[PDB]
């Protein structure tokens, strides 16, 4: 039986472990954190993730979809909150068949862990990868107490997240062609209780957004009517008094900021002060690699291979999509080296596409006529004019194809709106003809 060692029992690592063990591979999976299925007295702090069609499809191929969706909340659209006006629901699709799902990360990881073990994988927790000796084909692991263990490996899969230790080790033996692009926004994760969201009638079956120019909040629901809230805000003010994490010296400052800038959201954040001080501020960055593998010895996938900004909510979906593709190449290739090169060749252009579209979404949420004309064109020519957040989300269309069609649609709108102040001056039938001329079904 072919042997593989996977580092990181996250979303990509656990899924690929299941797909490989199900195909007869001897799978050993190492995770630095404890087993989350072992109940302790500690609280369960976990965020919700938006699971889209492409991510759900990957779970379907793994035979885990129904189990996952049973614990997921349906989000029919985005609920945009501008103070003074009732929330405006922008539906994601025609009906409840075009939706995305909010799933708690911890729940998903536990289901994937059970699935990988049911398929025959062996999972070892409380062991973090420290280094790799590629010549001797050995790696070193250690627990938090620093006690070290050495293991032989034949194939090494780096599914160890955006700060992959496997990636660091690979960069020592090959030039991965890394380019790091940091973003000026950080983020802070907050919470809304079930009592609070009910009291203020926050729609459970929707994704919620609080736009505010250079900063904003987003909220995803959970089964118990609580919401996970994420604040996006500049790390630093430009050189000066504009809002930034540096300007919010403590949780009391955060409250004043929210009471001023997010008045309809502050009442729902009961634990704002403590969450703001105890939850660390996250960083945003995009990391692009020219290559994802070292010969036939090691390969990266998920956040280890292509860290991206969380806008568009596609990091997990891409990671699950990576896992299916990697298992497919490994299963059917002439040899591991061929599989890893073919895997890289397939997935690298798609990762670049979603990395770019996520950043574009990041910029766009940090012109009104174009979106208004586009909303009309999407209703008049379905299957040809599909909004950006729908193509990435509701179809297994390769990311690069979603992007290519998005540019055609964006330019088409540019020509129709150019040199017009309002929509009554636009020839709607002429716009529709360009759609049929430049967008195949
Ligand atoms: C605020 C925020 C919100 C997001 N919202 C969404 C969303 O709505 N929808 C979506 O699709 N994506 C979302 N994402 C992106 C998504 O969370 C990641 O892309 C996804 O988790 C990637 O899965 P992964 O398996 O590659 O990495 P991870 O899920 O991070 O798993 C990596 C695993 O490897 C472990 N590990 C790390 N280092 C080591 C080591 N040396 N040794 C052993 N184990 C190690 C870690 O403990 C972890 O278990 C969001 C990201 C952020 C920061
Ligand atoms: O419809 C959308 O544009 C959409 C779907 C999922 C997300 C999402 C989820 C979590 C975070 Cl943190 C962010 Cl920034 C965005 O956005």
Residue numbers in the entry: 6 to 244, 247 to 373, 381 to 455
Task: Give passages from the manuscript.
Kynurenine 3-monooxygenase (KMO) regulates levels of neuroactive kynurenine pathway metabolites associated with neurodegeneration. Downregulation of KMO activity shifts the flux between the two branches of the KP toward increased KYNA formation, thus generating a neuroprotective environment. The KMO reaction is a random bi–bi mechanism proceeding through a ternary complex of KMO-bound to l-KYN and NADPH (steady-state enzymatic assays are described in Supplementary Methods) with a turnover value, kcat, of 8.2 ± 0.2 s−1 and Km values for NADPH and l-KYN of 16.9 ± 1.5 and 12.1 ± 1.4 µM, respectively. We next determined crystal structures of KMO in complex with the novel inhibitors or with l-KYN to inform the design of small-molecule inhibitors capable of penetrating the blood–brain barrier.
Compounds 9, 11–13 and 16–19 are structurally similar to the KMO inhibitor 6-(3,4-dichlorophenyl) pyrimidine-4-carboxylic acid, in which the pyrimidine ring of the reported inhibitor is replaced by an isosteric furan ring in 9, 11–13 and 16–19. To validate binding modes of the four inhibitors for which crystal structures were obtained (1, 4, 9 and 13), we investigated their mechanisms of inhibition. Consistent with the crystal structures, each compound was found to be a competitive inhibitor of l-KYN. In each case, the inhibitor was bound in the l-KYN-binding pocket, with the chlorinated aromatic moiety occupying a similar position to the substrate l-KYN aniline group. Furthermore, the carboxylate group of the inhibitor was in close proximity to PfKMO R83/Y97/N368. Notably, inhibitors 1, 4, 9, 13 do not stimulate KMO reduction by NADPH in rapid mixing stopped-flow assays. H2O2 production was not detected with compound 1 and PfKMO using a coupling reaction with o-dianisidine and horseradish peroxidase in the presence and absence of l-Kyn. This suggests that 1, 4, 9, 13 inhibit KMO activity in the absence of H2O2 production and thus may be preferable for therapeutic application.
